[PDB]
């Protein structure tokens, strides 16, 4: 089982990494959406100014 333990250690990192990569992508997607909302707001506010 010593070998299997090492493999499962990698599998935890992999599943965690996939979750982290997915969460990072989701966060980046939200950030771009917010930057877009802020940019749209900025344009309207610049016109408002």
């Amino acid at each position: 089982m010593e070998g299997k333990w090492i493999t499962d250690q990698l599998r935890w990192k992999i599943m965690s990494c996939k979750m982290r990569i997915e969460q990072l992508k989701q966060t980046i997607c939200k950030g771009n959406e917010e930057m877009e909302k802020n940019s749209e707001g900025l344009l309207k506010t610049k016109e408002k100014n």
């Binding site: 966060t27 980046i28 950030g31 707001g41 900025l42 506010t45």
Partner: protein, 50 residues
């Protein structure tokens, strides 16, 4: 993404701060104008009286 969001947010805040200042100045103009408007209405009634 965070840096760009921070920059866009900073620009929005700066533009909003100017908007609030302009809104306060616009309110003050309405107040002063109201004083001149009262006078204008008073003078029109006074002129017609004279």
């Amino acid at each position: 993404v965070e840096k760009n969001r921070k920059i866009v947010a900073e620009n929005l805040e700066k533009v909003q701060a100017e908007a609030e200042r302009l809104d306060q100045e616009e309110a003050q103009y309405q107040r002063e104008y109201s004083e001149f408007k009262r006078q204008q209405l008073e003078l029109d009634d006074e002129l017609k009286s004279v």
